[PDB]
């Protein structure tokens, strides 16, 4: 009680100091951030020396007295000082031994499941370690120098400006800004954090700190040998180095991983949708992407948050995010294969050959990725220059060099011709001529003598001694009898190039991209795998996938209607539960839209039941507002509920119906909805703070009494309120309709100017 | 990176429009972000409603190109003739049928509103935002909706720019857009205009020859001629393979520059108490009731510089020592840490004494005199290198619990290595040098300005592996000498060390220590008492090197790298656990006898390494670290001619110079150098590539 | 490439343009004027800064920019006030 | 952040905490008003400066 | 090959040419910025050393 008057004294006592006084008046609050950095803990010129100082003195450390006071014994139990009255700070001087004392002896309890989840992180990677099997040899190892590889990874990884805000919203509501982006879209992880963190205020400063961490791969630039799941990096240094090597390893890693590659092919498909139809790309593989919902582990996520932040770039997901405004670059992707650029510059050319084609005349130096195989180009005058390849299997080495042929594009180029005209030239699609590099490509990747084809192409010289362990033979061995001109294999791996950079433009009608004014960096169509597996994954909206039936349709969409158009103000579902009248909800026209779809046999039978629970709900404190949905369509008319032949239970979640637990979300058959601003469901009381707002900012005009956040949920539609927002800043708002059209809106117009 | 920065808070397409506007209807590479608002700011306003009829509401003018808008500006007079608005306005509106003009502005809104109100007047639906919530508008406000809308819009972007603290840049034309330039000082401009380097003065000329420059192939000239006038030397290093052998200074021989004796150092054993020995500074005082309490050196000593001081003193510690460990002198201390203040004159009066010159006023610096090569630091390391009686003097730690694949590897090296090493005589001193520094380091904290009796100990257990069951390993601690601090100067301690030692003194090596003849010790063996020698000696102590000296253990580890690494360089080759084997098998070449050529296998030629890096941690002169870091391009050289690479150095006399430069009066740093000499010779002699004088 | 600087000064202007003045803190020590010393940044910029408010009035500026401005604006002050400790006995 | 005074929004955010403990927590209401008086009479010395 | 070292280093170079160099780089940039690059060699080329 006086812990709130002693700081209004303070302040009292700081604004008659007419010094501080014009300091804490002039200007923004962001000053603080200067403030606090004009102080200086101490002077740092000798660390290990000054502690070894610090500590050689019996009673320098500074320390908390009240606690120590009220909990135990200041005194000793051997007769040698502990505590004196003697001070500037309100901490009291105290000796280290203390510390020790209150560890063994003090009276404490219970604490156990509190700690570890707030370091999950820590407690994880120890986890992992328990989980693995051993053994041990030696080798001269050859690493792989350089790659910039997730460490330390965790499942819902994220940017650091986002983080921030969840650190915002789960350490304290009281000082938090209205971030809607965050937290409409990623709701529920916000719940599960909020929820085990905010009820028991302990260490406020430290598990933020520590949370800030628990979502950041540390993407280090480190020397790995072959292994490279972003597990095994954590632990590196044990398993193995230049001369060190361990096993067993591979199988116990987090479920992050794989759900990865799941994303990419997920991309893969939304990528061939818009492949599907050539009238636009643009305008369309968008909606795909906004559309499709994602079901992370213990999380539903938007699609569109993990393409824009995912970190591992393929071919796919740069296409993916090419649609958006993310900007990933330093990446170049060719087919299945990898690349970087190093060296050099030039510009595309046109050049008709007898097999329109597009050479580049660089003198350029480039770095090869592919599987189990790297290696390094240079290409001048649309010829290879030099060559090296630092491969682990034969084959891949074959593959590498191929496909690096493929896109040097020698004269050898256009002299063979079996078939391509038949098929490879003019692709399926709307009519559409398909780019040539590509054209021979596919033509590789046909068959097996196709790949002997242009590796015979190539000059063939028996190499020279100083050339046995350098030569590459045709099947991709080091014997050196016969062997590729201007190559030459290394006994060893090849390092990765790295550049801090990021680029974006637009994509062509064709899922090109033409970024930084040319590169080609799209390819196109990387792989055509023409397969539709899925596991928990949502779809919406046209998708030209069938997984919508008529009955099923009529179902989803006709619960749809009620939920989604629910809400806004008075004559919608929260106006009419805030004034406990439960008859207008049942006559409402949403629900005459779903009436016709249920049994007609036991119609009454059914509206009975569904008519009772309503009104039993309608007492504040036990209605659960999930369940209202359910049961409401059924009460119109005058257990098991068949709407056209498919039952839906109260409770029990079902196929039609899934009623999820501890999170605002609902699945039908294939797909989700869910709304946010009307919940005050009994579950939902740790963001009951955060869920009711489907409030906007208005004018700052009336005498609105500020209230309190926790206050906020009384006050009805149509009630402009003032309210304390953020670090400082005092807005206005009221109950308003959703947010809408944030993209559309303006994409729309800038579709109708051209 | 300004799209990065607009493209991250507003939306992906809306930027382009900036992007594409901000070529041609200005030129502000910043400014895409305050429009990039503007723009977004109107479609929200226009899109989502549409008149009663299919056609509708608003229609959007501004994102169109500003030649475009001009002509659309124009269809109004065709539309409605009214007078042709000079002002192109931002929105046309058809249900109201007026011109509409958004304005968003930071401040107090009167400020924008009432310059925009003098542009147009009454004329357009001219409506003006500000981010924090606050409003001026003509008459009419748009509907209850899209000001819900578009304000809460505004209110976070606001936020967004308060996080990355974009707000003085973004001000609209009439306010600071105009205000943009950097602000020219006439001091400024002044400096600038006669800083250039060129014949031109002012700077404009100097920024036009560099904004129209354009480069020619004259360069290849310039660098002829450069190189015509340069003479560089194109060396080769066939012709000068001898380098001179090495330079050496020539003198009096190098004296003993480490704090503390080794070789001759005496001991004087004592089994330890754990409740006793605690104290560490107690250790002397339980010392005192046995034999110490007798030893007392004679008047006249061999070889002193100051004996009757020393002399004194020593009966002050040892009249210390039965009392309490500290010296109780006020006016002794001064004279013996003088052993001298100098008393000074303000300028301003000396002026007088310049004019009158009196007590002889001159100005004078002092440089330190060059010693000559050692012979007895040869005999030192092969003392150092021996095992000792004693078995273990750095405490070490305990062994972690182990996981058999790399643990068992680690925990074995580590026990093997630490067996080697703690049995030797250099560990002892390590042992001595980190407990007394230690102690001393803890004293000075404890009594600053006073005088204090510290003792020169090191800690040692005794091992017995005879087979039989005796009563223990023997636990303990032995005793070097005394010591006494001095606190003087923060900055350098003055201090006092006092060694009993069994062997004659040298004066060639000794000759700052200053020696006397104590009396006798009992010496004794079975399967007899020499006399006892008291050196003495004063030196200086940096807190620094008190610091680095107390942590000397340090050299156990850059021993064991360079160790290690090669027993696993060999093993890899084979792909077997050849650590074992390469430890006892591989040779490794330790010295010369006879003239021939020695090796030793490298777990004993490892205690020269450690032996190596503990004097680098003792000998460390500032002529020591500019030695290796010059030394360093001859070994360079030396591998180069190794493995016949055909190198070469520019201007070697002139290495050789920076070499010798760095040559003064260390022992060690002059050692090394003599030793380098007889590897080159030695090398020279395998293979050819160097001179033997 | 063809425009290396323009770009890479873009990337600067707009770190820079950015930046709070307050960032300046962070760094090795540098020379105080006000008592003619070496100091840890932060303190002597506070000494700096202060100054400047008790000669002119408080700095408003919170960028790199205006703190620029400011210290090109002090060359032409013909007078400037300190923070300077003098001992009487 | 925000574009408000530290003083004004610290003396903003104590009068909501103690709304929010008076309201429904366990503190007195004349205690409140001293609250209040206190922070009104902190303004005042802030704003002859 | 050849090991590289320097003698003299900071020495030898000048924020004489420092300016030109920066003139020469800020082109094309902005004159607004380009005032604010070559500000910093200036108070070099007119530099107190204590």
Request: charged share 30%; hydrophobic share 35%; glycine share 6%.
């Amino acid at each position: 009680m006086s812990l709130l008057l002693t700081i209004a004294k303070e302040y009292k006592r700081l604004c008659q100091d007419a010094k501080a006084a014009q300091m804490m008046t002039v200007g923004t609050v962001s000053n603080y951030t200067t403030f606090k950095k004009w102080t200086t803990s101490r002077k740092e010129k000798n660390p290990s020396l000054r502690m070894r100082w610090a500590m050689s003195s019996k009673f320098p450390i500074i320390a908390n007295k009240r606690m120590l006071e009220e909990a135990q014994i200041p005194k000793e139990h051997n007769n040698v000082a502990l505590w004196e009255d003697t001070e500037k700070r309100d901490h009291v001087l105290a000796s280290a031994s203390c510390i020790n004392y209150w560890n063994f002896c003090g009276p404490c309890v219970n604490n156990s499941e509190v700690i570890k989840e707030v370091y999950k992180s820590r407690f994880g990677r120890l986890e992992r370690r328990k989980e693995i099997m051993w053994k041990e040899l030696r080798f001269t190892l050859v690493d792989r120098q350089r790659r910039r590889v997730d460490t330390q990874p965790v499942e819902q990884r994220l940017r650091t400006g986002e983080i921030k805000d969840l650190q915002m919203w789960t350490l304290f509501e009281d000082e938090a800004p209205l971030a809607s982006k965050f937290i409409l879209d990623n709701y529920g992880l916000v719940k599960e954090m909020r929820s085990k963190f905010a009820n028991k205020p302990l260490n406020k400063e430290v598990v933020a700190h520590m949370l800030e961490k628990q979502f950041n791969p540390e993407s280090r630039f480190l020397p790995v040998f072959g292994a490279i799941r972003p597990e095994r990096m954590e632990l590196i240094h044990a398993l193995g180095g230049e001369t060190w090597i361990q096993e067993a390893n591979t199988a116990g890693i987090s479920n992050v991983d794989q759900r990865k590659n799941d994303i990419r092919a997920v991309c893969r498909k939304v990528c061939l949708a818009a492949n599907a139809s050539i009238m636009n790309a643009k305008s369309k593989l968008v909606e795909y992407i906004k559309s499709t919902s994602m079901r992370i582990g213990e999380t539903e996520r938007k699609l569109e948050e993990l393409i824009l932040e995912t970190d591992d770039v393929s071919p796919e997901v740069t296409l993916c995010k090419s649609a958006l405004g993310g900007q990933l670059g330093k990446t170049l992707s060719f087919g299945p294969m990898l690349l970087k650029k190093i060296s050099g510059s030039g510009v595309k050319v046109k050049d008709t050959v007898y097999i329109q084609f597009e050479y580049w005349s660089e003198q350029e130096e480039f770095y090869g990725e592919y599987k189990s195989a790297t290696a390094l180009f240079s290409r001048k005058e649309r010829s290879l220059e030099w060559i090296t390849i630092g491969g682990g299997i034969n084959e891949d080495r074959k593959r590498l060099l191929a496909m690096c042929m493929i896109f040097c594009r020698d004269g050898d180029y256009f002299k063979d011709a079996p078939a391509t005209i038949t098929m490879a030239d003019l692709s399926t699609k709307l009519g559409r001529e398909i780019p040539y590099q590509y054209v021979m490509m596919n033509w590789i990747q046909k068959s097996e003598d196709n790949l002997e084809a242009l590796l015979y192409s190539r000059g063939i010289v028996e190499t020279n001694p100083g050339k046995m362990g350098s030569s590459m033979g045709i099947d991709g061995s080091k014997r050196a009898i016969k062997s590729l001109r201007a190559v030459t294999i290394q006994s060893g791996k090849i390092d990765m190039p790295e550049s801090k950079e990021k680029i974006h433009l637009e994509l062509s009608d064709n899922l090109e991209a033409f970024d930084s004014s040319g590169r080609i960096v799209a390819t196109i169509l990387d792989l055509p795998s023409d397969k539709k597996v899925t596991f928990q994954d949502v779809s919406f909206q046209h998708p030209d996938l069938a997984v919508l039936r008529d009955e099923k349709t009529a179902i989803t969409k006709g619960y749809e209607a009620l939920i989604k158009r629910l809400g806004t103000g008075d004559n919608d579902i929260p106006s009419l539960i805030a004034k406990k009248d439960y008859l207008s909800l049942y006559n409402l026209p949403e629900v005459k839209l779903m009436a016709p779809l249920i049994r007609p046999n036991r119609k009454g039978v059914y509206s009975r039941v569904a008519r009772k629970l309503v009104s039993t709900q309608v007492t504040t404190g036990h209605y659960s507002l999930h369940e209202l949905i359910k049961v409401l369509p059924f009460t119109y008319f005058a257990r098991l509920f068949f709407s056209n032949d498919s039952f839906v239970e109260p409770g029990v979640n079902n196929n039609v119906f899934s009623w999820s637990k501890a999170d605002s979300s609902k699945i039908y058959c294939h797909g989700i909805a869910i709304r946010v601003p009307l919940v005050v469901g009994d579950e939902h009381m740790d963001t009951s703070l955060a869920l009711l707002e489907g409030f906007s900012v208005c004018e700052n005009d009336p005498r609105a009494p500020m209230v309190t956040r926790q206050d906020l949920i009384d006050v009805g539609f149509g009630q402009k309120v003032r309210l304390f927002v953020g670090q400082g800043s005092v807005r206005t708002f009221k109950r308003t309709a959703s947010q809408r059209a944030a993209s559309s809106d303006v994409n729309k117009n800038v579709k109708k100017i051209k | 990176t300004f799209a990065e920065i607009a493209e991250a808070f507003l939306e992906p397409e809306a930027v382009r429009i900036a992007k594409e506007a901000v070529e041609e209807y200005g030129d502000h590479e910043r400014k895409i972000i305050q429009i990039g608002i503007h723009f977004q700011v109107c479609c929200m306003f226009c899109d989502e409603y549409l008149s009663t009829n299919g056609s509708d509401r608003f229609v959007l003018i501004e994102g169109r190109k500003r030649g475009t808008a001009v002509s659309l500006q124009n269809e109004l007079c065709k539309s409605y003739d009214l007078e042709p608005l000079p002002f192109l306005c931002d929105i046309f509106d058809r249900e109201e049928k007026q011109f509409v003009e958004i304005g968003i502005t930071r401040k107090a809104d009167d400020s924008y509103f009432q310059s925009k109100f003098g542009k147009l007047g009454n004329s357009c639906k001219i409506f003006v935002f500000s981010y924090d919530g606050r409003l001026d508008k003509n008459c009419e406000g748009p509907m209850e909706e899209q000001k819900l809308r578009i304000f809460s819009f505004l209110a976070t972007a606001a936020d967004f720019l308060r996080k990355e603290n974009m707000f003085n840049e973004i001000f609209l034309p009439d306010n600071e857009e105009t205000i943009i330039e950097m602000k020219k000082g006439k001091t400024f401009l002044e400096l600038r205009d006669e800083s250039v380097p060129l014949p031109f003065q002012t700077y404009e000329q100097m920024k036009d020859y560099c904004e129209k420059f354009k480069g020619n192939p004259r360069e290849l000239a310039s660098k002829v001629s450069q190189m015509q006038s340069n003479i560089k030397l194109p060396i080769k290093h066939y012709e000068q393979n001898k380098f001179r052998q090495i330079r050496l200074p020539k003198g009096p021989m190098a004296p003993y520059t480490h704090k503390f004796l080794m070789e001759e150092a005496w001991m004087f054993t004592k089994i330890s108490d754990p409740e006793r020995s605690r104290a560490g500074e107690i250790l002397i005082d339980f010392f005192k009731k046995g034999n110490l309490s007798a030893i007392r050196p004679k008047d006249k000593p061999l070889q002193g510089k100051y004996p009757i001081h020393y002399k004194n003193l020593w009966n002050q510690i040892k009249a210390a020592i039965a009392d309490r460990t500290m010296v109780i002198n006020e006016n002794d201390h001064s004279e013996f840490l003088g052993g001298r203040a100098s008393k000074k004159i303000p300028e301003i009066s000396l002026t007088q004494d310049v004019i009158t010159t009196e007590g002889l006023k001159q100005s004078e610096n002092k440089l330190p005199e060059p010693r000559s090569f050692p012979r007895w630091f040869n005999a030192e390391w092969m003392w150092a290198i021996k095992d000792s009686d004693l078995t273990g003097w750095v405490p070490m730690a305990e062994y972690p619990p182990a996981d058999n694949e790399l643990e068992d590897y680690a925990e074995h090296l580590n026990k093997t290595m630490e067996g080697v090493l703690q049995g030797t005589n250099c560990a002892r001193e390590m042992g001595k040098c980190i407990l007394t520094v230690g102690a001393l380091m803890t004293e000075c904290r404890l009594f600053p300005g006073k005088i204090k009796v510290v003792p020169i100990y090191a800690r040692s257990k005794e091992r017995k592996s005879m087979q039989e069951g005796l009563p223990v390993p023997s636990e303990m601690d032995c005793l070097f000498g005394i010591c006494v601090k001095s606190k003087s100067h923060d900055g350098m301690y003055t201090i006092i060390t006092f060694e009993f030692s069994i062997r004659e003194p040298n004066l060639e090596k000794h000759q700052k220590y200053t020696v006397f003849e104590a009396g006798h010790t009992t010496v004794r063996m079975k399967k007899r008492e020499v006399p006892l020698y008291l050196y003495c000696r004063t030196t200086a102590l940096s807190k620094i090197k008190n610091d680095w000296l107390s942590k000397a253990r340090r050299c156990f580890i850059t021993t064991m790298d360079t160790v290690e690494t090669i027993c696993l360089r060999e093993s890899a080759k084979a792909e077997e656990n050849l650590v074992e084997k390469t430890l006892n098998e591989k040779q490794m070449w330790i010295g010369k006898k006879n003239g021939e050529l020695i090796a030793q296998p490298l777990r004993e030629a490892l205690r020269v390494q450690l032996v190596q890096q503990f004097y680098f941690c003792i000998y460390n002169d500032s002529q020591l670290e500019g030695f290796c870091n010059e030394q360093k391009k001859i070994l360079m050289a030396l591998e180069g001619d190794k493995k016949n690479k055909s190198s070469f150095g520019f201007n070697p006399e002139g290495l050789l110079e920076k070499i010798e430069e760095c040559l003064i009066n260390n022992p060690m740093c002059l050692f090394m150098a003599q030793r380098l000499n007889e590897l080159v010779i030695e090398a020279s002699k395998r293979g050819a590539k160097f001179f033997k004088t | 490439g063809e425009g290396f600087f323009k770009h890479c000064v873009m990337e600067a202007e707009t770190e820079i343009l950015k930046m709070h003045f307050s960032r300046l803190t962070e760094g090795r020590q540098t020379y105080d004027w006000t008592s003619e010393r070496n100091m840890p940044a932060a303190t002597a910029l506070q000494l700096t800064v202060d100054a400047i408010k008790e000669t002119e009035g408080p700095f408003k500026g919170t960028t790199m920019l205006e703190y620029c401005n400011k210290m090109i604006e002090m060359l032409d002050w013909k007078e400037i006030k300190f923070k300077k400790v003098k001992t009487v006995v | 952040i925000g574009a408000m005074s530290i003083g004004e929004a610290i003396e903003e955010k104590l009068l909501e905490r103690a709304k929010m403990k008076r309201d429904i927590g366990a503190i007195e209401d004349s205690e409140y008003e001293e609250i209040k008086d206190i922070i009104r009479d902190a303004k005042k010395a802030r704003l002859e400066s | 090959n050849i090991t590289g070292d320097n003698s003299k280093w900071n020495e030898c170079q000048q924020p004489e040419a420092y300016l030109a160099l920066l003139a020469y780089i800020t082109k094309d940039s902005s004159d607004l910025m380009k005032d604010l690059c070559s500000v910093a060699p200036v108070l070099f080329c007119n530099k107190f050393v204590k």
